[PDB]
Design a protein around this ligand. Structure first.
Ligand code: CLA
Ligand code: CLA
Ligand code: CLA
Ligand code: CLA
Ligand code: CLA
Ligand code: CLA
Ligand code: CLA
Ligand code: LHG
Ligand code: II0
Ligand code: II0
Ligand code: IHT
Ligand code: SF4
Lengths: 129, 170, 742, 194, 42
């Protein structure tokens, strides 16, 4: 029910659980929120001792992404218990703000990453040039 | 109702505050399948082993017996595999675990709490209230020491420094 | 969404109480023994679920959980095969010298002098030589170390624990309802797409990213511990692009449909790798990738929950013509309400596939260094011929159990089953005539040759030298397959198999494969095969077609699937049941598969296997005696059984003395079986009476009154020891012979 | 209703505190399977044998009969040195004692057939030392306890003679520690034999 | 221990398999420590 512009042109809602769809969308929203803000954050400032897409593989060799994967994997296991227990059975503005900025983050992150393919640069780095 | 620990996870339903230390954390639902008395016996047994192990580390760096060589606790495992005292400890643990098998049958047959061996030589447990707090503290320490154990052994492997010397350095 | 998951929760209580009550599952056996027949009847009927329960739901639940128990045993078996390879094997020494070291993954304890079985297999190792081909699998997998064999062993143990949990869980905690099991479209969609399709695709991925790089380095000659670990190929795409430069382009050629870029590792070479004598693994990777696609495509055919798809009932009911009445109507109802009808099909197909596996694996050797390991080539051919023959006879066993029990004429009026039963005299009389013709014109040619050679008339024999019965059709098909590369398979570089013709492939101076020429002896023994297969079909088809009734017994269905007789009247009706045709057809299966493996063994030693030396000529194991000596029975007796039994008889005091003992032990078991086959129950009960008397005399008679075995059980015990003895004799003879000379 | 010896187990049936040395110790529940009368007969017999055997080891260290065949301080060496004829004489005499003192009620189905028969009570009181019924309970207790202690003590002494090829008192007076370079336990299957 | 599980272990095939495995096992052990006994040593 939140963020309902009557926009389901392909009618996916008819052949998959609305609870599953909303959970997947909000998870995608929040992941892309973190990813897009992080992508702009790296060009703004750098953590000590530490670009868009190849830095994934610059980080895996240290074991950073592997460690992050382990902790996301742990949380996602308790969260798969969460979604299964969801499925087997002044704030509404804020939920809609979250979902709207999250859809925007998905567009934004897609833009930044394909901008990397175009120019080998991060988002605001290219914006500056 | 919802789990006390994980707000968004539902309560398991085989975990209805029956045992002390129950915060409803059971996502895999092993208590929906397996006997919770068996699981609690294992929880306390694994935890008591872990507590004796973490202390075992700490004291073994601080002191070692004069008749035994000075060395690191993992090196002690391998030395006492080949020396003979490891089999000693394994035999006597296994001996006690025989009467532990009888104890677990007594628990399954309804006549014993899962970790209760009536081991109160120093009479520290006084009445019901202090005993409930003591066993809550025992469960919390047992879980924490299980976590701790992984850290000391794994960290020694990654960096060949003992737990106290690793705090001392870096 | 009429395809849905439906489960009864906590159906059956996990209690030890019925364990303590043997026979609890049937009303007859649950009241306890009074004669020793009860003990045998307990084991005989235990997995006959549809004999204990009326409901198809409880039967289906028992079957589903028993299939998990079988999977748990197979995973445990596989895990132990890896552990013995990891811990008690010369695998690592064999990786360095595949042509010199003999595989061995079983070491015996020294107890009663039995440590003589730890023979010198090579690589500073002593053990029992193993012929299952695991070493060649592991090298094909890219294992390269015992450490990885321990992880595979643990992976089997974890799977073994998970299957036994699932069998318990799905019988005792969450048992599916009958409407779940009766989803044939859903099950076929998932078993084609998910099981077989993602099975092939995932294995293709392992082959491409692990098997192909590791085996290219091995066949280049790199030492096994000098080879990068399998994940360094997954990450370092530069290192993978060294071996296969197409990896420099990644997955853009896959998605943009520029598949020709991938020809480095997705080839269509054909033939064998010259270094290992095995199939090119770039071919097997392309084979599994292509198989995966059309299994995933095939699993979208049937209709489940969205209107797209076929109804299998509609397909069957539409296929009816002017000869066949109502056609395939009612077959869907049979195959979704009878487990035996499903088991009859699936056993006959699995047995057929196992027979095909035997032919395809010797001729197109898939693993590295398996073609020149002749003990393995003989072992896996012989093993998969026996698995096939047994499974084929159980297909007719359960076709009979269906007809006797699950067949209902009311639901099968004028369809294909109704019509088969209504002209079964025409089928059985025509098959009977073919088997007489075939026996006279295949085995009688041998008898003609025995006589002519004995009479001094070698010009009067059917031989390559004399009157010639050439297999022109087989020779012509062999011609076509050698001409196929560049002609009718234009992009293939070599033939599918060198057995059809072409080069001699030699690995370590031993022949991997070479053209298997067909002559008069090959014509003769192939018609021997067609005769023994047709008679086996005759015995098993007559049992299925006459399972319910005959002209002899008009009410055979009321006596059941398994009854000994209907009395000494009508002249005698001994062995009139459908069970008794499975009993008689397992002997003729044994006869059939025994000639197949004998034909394979003699032909491969005489014409294929052996050593290559200067001038490229091949010295075969038995020196090409098949052509002029497999045309008489005396040749098979003398030049095959007598000549090749030398190794197993002279094996005492060696590491092969175990085969010498099993040779004699199986000869014993076979002969002992004839006590049960040629005798009758009435003699043995009267003999037991006198033995009971001597016990009564000493007041030591048992309260479970001893009985002679039933008429059926005497037949079952006789057949089981005949098969154990007959096959066990050949197993020792085959294994001691080919380990010594090949 | 818990055991006194093992406080976390239930008190075993057929153990009611009547017998001497009864403290509630039967964790494996053999008393529920095997009649306590047979078990006490066997316990008293094992303990009486071991009292003699432990005393045999120590005194045989100190005091010998004359002759070279009886000059073995190490008691395990005395087994081989002692005249075989006389050792088999001991064995035969033990068998005759076993049949007569039990009065041909030897087996698991006919010992205690007489309701008068008591576990361990063979009628052996040559000097009538158990005539006083006031000393009876403490004699029964200390007989059971001496028997248990001597079972444990003799077991230890035998396996210390195996490990250290020394007699028990002079193993205490000339002690040598276990090097572990010899007598490693197990290992028949670890090296796969040999 | 469960009485129905002990009644299961008292069944004829389990006891037959256990007893003859135990019997086979001390013949095996006796031939390990004391091998090649063709005769009673006398
Ligand atoms: C599934 C197939 C399989 C097969 C056929 C074998 C076969 C063998 N193994 Mg291997 N093994 C396997 C799996 C397998 N193993 C797995 C999965 C592991 C990993 C744990 C191992 C690990 C392993 C080791 C570590 C060793 C072997 C060894 C052996 C050999 C001797 C075994 C022996 O006598 O021990 C007998 C041991 C006993 C305790 C005897 C038990 C007899 C009882 C009475 C059987 C009764 C079953 C019972 C009645 C069932 C009913 C239950 C009940 C409740 C009623 C033999 C060649 C040995 C070897 O090769 O030495 C050189 C060896 O040392 N195996
Ligand atoms: C993609 C879906 C899928 C898959 C893979 C299978 C697989 C299987 N089914 Mg089927 N099944 C399915 C859907 C599926 N089923 C559906 C939808 C229904 C309802 C109509 C059924 C109803 C059904 C019945 C009634 C029976 C089976 C049976 C079987 C087993 C056949 C024996 C065999 O070859 O096992 C060996 C081959 C293996 C590969 C062993 C694999 C074990 C696991 C379970 C496979 C899947 C693991 C997982 C998905 C892979 C993760 C990959 C990850 C590492 C990336 C096999 C495990 C039979 C059986 O044996 O029961 C146990 C049986 O009686 N199934
Ligand atoms: C939340 C993340 C986080 C945080 C708080 C830090 C913080 C720090 N890192 Mg770390 N680091 C990070 C992520 C992070 N890093 C990541 C993702 C990597 C890549 C795997 C590294 C790799 C890295 C290396 C290789 C090193 C550090 C070091 C340091 C310290 C430098 C002090 C400094 O210059 O501060 C500002 C100080 C001043 C302005 C004046 C002094 C500091 C404590 C260095 C250090 O001291 O470690 C011993 C060091 O050698 N970091
Ligand atoms: C009272 C029973 C008992 C007995 C007779 C033994 C006997 C032995 N123990 Mg054991 N032990 C026991 C109980 C016992 N232990 C218990 C309850 C534990 C705690 C679980 C251990 C833990 C243990 C270890 C860790 C070691 C021994 C060792 C030894 C050996 C010591 C060698 C010696 O005599 O020189 C030593 C003489 C003295 C110490 C004088 C006092 C010997 C086989 C050692 C050994 O060498 O093994 C081969 C060894 O390292 N024991
Ligand atoms: C997927 C395969 C499969 C499955 C599930 C079944 C399942 C079934 N079959 Mg079918 N069958 C099969 C394959 C299969 N069979 C094959 C391959 C054959 C050909 C031989 C047959 C021939 C056959 C007949 C002729 C009959 C059945 C029957 C049965 C049912 C009863 C099973 C029972 O209680 O036996 C209990 C199991 C035993 C008693 C095991 C003992 C069997 C042998 C003698 C022991 C094995 C020897 C061993 C491998 C080697 C020993 C080594 C030695 C050196 C010591 C059950 C429905 C019977 C029935 O009435 O169904 C309604 C029946 O009469 N089956
Ligand atoms: C060497 C042993 C042997 C032989 C020769 C036969 C022969 C035959 N069996 Mg039998 N069978 C045997 C063992 C044998 N069986 C055993 C052990 C079993 C136990 C399970 C069975 C069970 C069995 C069943 C269940 C069935 C057969 C069938 C057949 C026939 C196959 C058709 C055929 O080949 O016709 C051709 C005849 C022969 C090959 C016989 C040899 C004739 C040769 C060519 C020489 C002829 C010489 C000539 C007549 C001389 C004339 C002059 C002379 C009189 C002076 C045939 C009569 C099937 C049958 O009858 O259907 C057709 C059938 O259903 N058999
Ligand atoms: C049927 C009666 C009989 C006969 C004729 C013999 C004859 C013999 N015995 Mg035998 N003996 C017997 C019964 C008999 N024994 C019984 C019943 C036992 C078991 C208790 C023994 C135990 C035995 C041993 C252990 C030895 C003999 C020896 C001998 C031989 C040398 C005797 C010698 O020099 O004595 C003259 C010497 C003495 C009389 C010195 C006696 C030493 C004292 C009395 C021993 C202390 C007894 C002790 C307290 C036992 C109490 C337990 C008992 C009451 C149950 C001689 C062939 C010896 C032998 O084989 O020599 C080759 C030998 O070593 N005997
Ligand atoms: C009331 C009486 C109480 C008796 C207590 C027993 C005290 C001594 C027990 C052993 C002490 C320490 C053992 C360490 C020694 C040890 O564990 O060695 C290990 C040994 C196997 O050798 P491995 O595979 O370990 O080889 C390891 C490599 O490092 C060397 O090659 O285990 C055994 O199987 C030996 C015991 C025989 C097993 C069968 C015994 C006879 C069966 C009779 C019926 C059952 C009786 C009970 C069986 C458990
Ligand atoms: C019950 C009973 C009795 C008794 C008794 C006994 C023996 C009681 C003994 C109890 C013991 C030993 C409790 C120890 C708990 C240890 C814990 C919780 C671990 C903490 C470690 C942490 C948090 C960490 C860490 C870290 C990691 C991993 C690695 C480092 O690089 C860094 C860091 C250090 C931060 C008696 C006999 C008195 C009688 C009585 O009547 C009944
Ligand atoms: C009943 C009756 C009468 C009688 C009588 C008789 C014959 C009475 C004799 C009774 C005896 C012999 C009692 C002996 C008990 C011995 C014990 C408890 C030893 C335990 C050893 C231990 C704990 C140890 C140890 C050791 C270990 C392993 C380590 C070693 O390195 C050293 C060490 C030694 C320290 C008579 C016939 C008079 C008549 C009467 O009318 C009725
Ligand atoms: C093999 C061998 C040896 C050995 C050894 C041994 C014993 C090695 C030790 C192995 C152990 C104990 C590993 C366990 C580590 C604990 C973990 C990973 C828990 C993490 C908590 C998590 C992920 C989350 C926690 C959570 C978060 C988010 C916060 C909320 C709470 C919670 C939900 C719980 C030797 C030494 C004997 C030598 C010998 O020669 C060879
Ligand atoms: S009882 Fe035996 S001999 Fe008589 S008809 Fe039946 S099977 Fe034939």
């Amino acid at each position: 029910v939140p963020g309902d512009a009557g926009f389901d042109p392909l009618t996916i809602s008819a052949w998959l659980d609305s609870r599953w769809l909303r959970e997947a969308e909000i998870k995608h929203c929040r992941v892309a929120m973190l990813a897009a803000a992080g992508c702009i954050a790296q060009d703004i400032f750098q953590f000590p001792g530490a670009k868009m897409t190849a830095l994934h593989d610059a980080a895996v060799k240290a074991g950073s992404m592997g460690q992050m994967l382990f902790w996301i994997g742990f949380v996602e296991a308790i969260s798969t218990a969460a979604t299964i227990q969801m499925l087997q059975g002044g704030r509404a503005r804020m939920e809609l703000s979250e979902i709207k900025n999250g859809r925007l983050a998905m567009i934004g992150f897609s833009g930044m990453v394909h901008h990397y393919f175009i120019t080998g640069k991060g988002p605001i780095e290219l914006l500056t040039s | 109702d919802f789990s006390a620990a994980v707000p968004f996870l539902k309560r398991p339903s085989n975990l209805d505050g029956a045992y002390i230390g129950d915060v409803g954390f059971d996502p895999l639902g092993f208590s929906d399948v397996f006997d919770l008395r068996v699981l609690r016996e294992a929880e306390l047994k694994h935890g008591r082993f872990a507590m004796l192990a973490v202390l075992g580390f700490i004291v073994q760096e601080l002191y070692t017996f004069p008749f035994f060589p000075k060395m690191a606790p993992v090196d002690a495992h391998d030395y006492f595999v080949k020396q003979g005292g490891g089999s000693q400890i394994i035999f006597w643990i296994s001996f006690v675990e025989l009467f532990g098998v009888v104890a677990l049958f007594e628990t399954l047959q309804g006549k014993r709490e899962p970790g209760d061996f009536a081991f109160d030589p120093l009479g520290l447990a006084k009445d019901e209230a202090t005993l409930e707090r003591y066993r809550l503290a025992e469960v919390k320490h047992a879980r924490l020491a299980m976590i701790a154990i992984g850290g000391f052994i794994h960290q020694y492997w990654v960096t060949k420094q003992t737990v106290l010397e690793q705090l001392g350095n870096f | 969404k009429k395809v849905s998951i439906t489960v009864d929760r906590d159906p059956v209580a996990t209690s030890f109480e019925k364990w303590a009550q043997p026979g609890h599952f049937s009303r007859t056996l649950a009241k306890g023994p009074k004669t020793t027949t009860w003990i045998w009847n307990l084991h005989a009927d235990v997995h006959d679920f549809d004999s204990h329960t009326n409901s198809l739901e409880d039967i289906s639940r028992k079957i589903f959980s028993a299939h998990f128990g079988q999977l748990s045993i197979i995973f445990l078996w596989l895990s132990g095969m890896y552990f013995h390879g990891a811990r008690f094997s010369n695998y690592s020494a064999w990786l360095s010298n595949p042509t010199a070291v003999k595989p061995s993954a079983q070491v015996v304890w020294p107890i009663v002098g039995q440590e003589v079985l730890n023979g010198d297999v090579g690589g500073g190792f002593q053990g029992v030589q193993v012929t299952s081909g695991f070493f060649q699998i592991w090298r094909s997998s890219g294992i390269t170390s015992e450490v990885e064999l321990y992880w595979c062993a643990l992976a089997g143990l974890i799977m073994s624990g998970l299957m036994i949990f699932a069998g318990w869980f799905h019988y005792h905690k969450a048992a599916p309802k009958l409407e779940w099991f009766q989803n044939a479209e859903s099950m076929l969609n998932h078993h084609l797409s998910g099981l077989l399709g993602l099975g092939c695709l995932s294995w293709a991925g392992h082959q491409i990213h692990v098997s192909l790089p590791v085996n290219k380095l091995l066949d280049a000659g790199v030492a096994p511990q000098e080879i990068p670990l399998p994940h360094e190929f997954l990450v370092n795409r530069d290192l993978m692009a060294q071996l296969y430069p197409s990896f420099s382009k990644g997955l853009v050629p896959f998605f943009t449909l520029n598949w020709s870029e991938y020809s480095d590792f997705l080839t269509f070479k054909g033939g064998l790798n010259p270094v290992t004598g095995g199939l090119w693994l770039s071919d097997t990777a392309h084979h599994h990738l292509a198989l995966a696609v059309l299994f995933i495509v095939a699993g979208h055919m049937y209709r489940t929950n969205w209107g797209i798809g076929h109804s299998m009932k509609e397909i069957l009911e539409a296929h009816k013509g002017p000869f066949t009445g109502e056609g395939h109507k009612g077959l869907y109802e049979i195959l979704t309400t009878s487990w035996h009808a499903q088991l009859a099909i699936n056993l006959a197909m699995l047995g057929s596939v196992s027979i095909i596996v035997a032919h395809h694996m010797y001729a197109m050797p898939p693993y590295p260094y398996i073609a020149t390991d002749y003990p393995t080539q003989l072992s896996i051919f012989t093993h998969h011929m026996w698995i096939g023959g047994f499974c084929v006879c159980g297909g007719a066993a359960h076709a009979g159990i269906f007809m006797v029990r699950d067949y209902n004429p009311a639901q099968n009026y004028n369809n294909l089953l109704d019509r088969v039963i209504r002209h079964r005299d025409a089928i059985i009389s025509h098959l009977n005539w073919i088997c007489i013709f075939l026996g006279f014109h295949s085995f009688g040619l041998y008898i003609h040759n025995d006589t002519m050679r004995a009479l001094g008339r070698t010009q009067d024999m059917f031989s390559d030298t004399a009157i010639q019965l050439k297999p022109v059709f087989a020779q012509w098909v062999q011609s076509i397959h050698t001409l196929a590369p560049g002609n009718t398979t234009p992009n293939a570089l070599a033939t599918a198999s060198y057995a059809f013709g072409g080069d001699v492939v030699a690995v370590g101076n031993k022949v991997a494969m070479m053209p298997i020429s067909l002559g008069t002896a090959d014509f003769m023994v192939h018609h021997i095969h067609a005769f023994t297969i047709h008679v086996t079909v005759l015995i098993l088809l007559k049992g299925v077609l006459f399972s319910r009734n005959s002209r002899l017994i008009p009410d055979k269905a009321n006596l059941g699937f398994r009854f000994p007789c209907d009395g000494p009247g009508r002249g005698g009706t001994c062995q009139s049941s459908a069970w008794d045709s499975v009993f008689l057809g397992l002997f003729w299966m044994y006869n059939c598969i025994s000639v197949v493996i004998f034909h394979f063994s003699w032909k491969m030693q005489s014409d294929v296997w052996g050593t290559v030396q200067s001038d490229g000529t091949v010295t075969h194991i038995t020196g090409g005696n098949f052509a002029q000596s497999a045309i008489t029975i005396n040749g098979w007796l003398r030049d095959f059984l007598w000549a090749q039994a030398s190794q197993v008889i002279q094996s005492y005091g060696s590491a092969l003395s175990a085969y010498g003992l099993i040779f004699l032990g199986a000869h014993f078991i076979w002969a002992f079986s004839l006590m049960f086959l040629f005798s009758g129950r009435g003699y043995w009960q009267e003999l037991i009476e006198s033995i009971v008397w001597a016990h009564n005399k000493l007041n030591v008679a048992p309260a479970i009154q001893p009985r002679a075995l039933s008429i059926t059980q005497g037949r079952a015990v006789g057949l089981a020891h005949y098969l154990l003895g007959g096959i066990g004799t050949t197993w020792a003879f085959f294994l001691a012979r080919i380990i010594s000379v090949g | 209703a818990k055991s006194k010896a093992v406080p976390f187990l239930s008190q075993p049936e057929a153990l009611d505190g009547s017998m001497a040395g009864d403290v509630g110790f039967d964790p494996f529940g053999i008393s529920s399977v095997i009649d306590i009368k047979w078990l006490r007969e066997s316990e008293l017999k094992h303990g009486r044998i071991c009292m003699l055997a432990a005393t045999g080891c120590l005194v045989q260290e100190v005091v010998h009969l004359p002759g070279p065949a009886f000059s073995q301080k190490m008691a395990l060496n005395a087994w081989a040195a002692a005249p075989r004829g006389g050792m088999i004489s001991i064995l035969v005499a033990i068998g005759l004692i076993e049949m007569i003192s039990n009065r041909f009620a030897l087996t698991a189905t006919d010992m205690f057939a007489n309701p008068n028969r008591v576990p361990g009570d063979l009628g052996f009181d040559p000097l009538s030392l158990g005539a006083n019924p006031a000393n009876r309970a403490r004699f029964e207790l200390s007989e059971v306890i001496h028997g248990r202690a001597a079972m444990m003590g003799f077991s230890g002494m035998v396996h210390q003679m195996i490990v250290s090829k020394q007699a028990p008192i002079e193993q205490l007076m000339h002690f040598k520690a276990v090097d572990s370079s010899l007598m490693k336990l197990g290992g028949a299957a670890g090296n796969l034999g040999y | 221990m469960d009485s129905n599980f002990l009644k299961y272990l008292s069944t004829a095939p389990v006891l037959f398999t256990v007893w003859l495995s135990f019997t086979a096992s001390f013949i095996i052990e006796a031939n390990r420590f004391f091998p090649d006994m063709l005769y009673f040593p006398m």
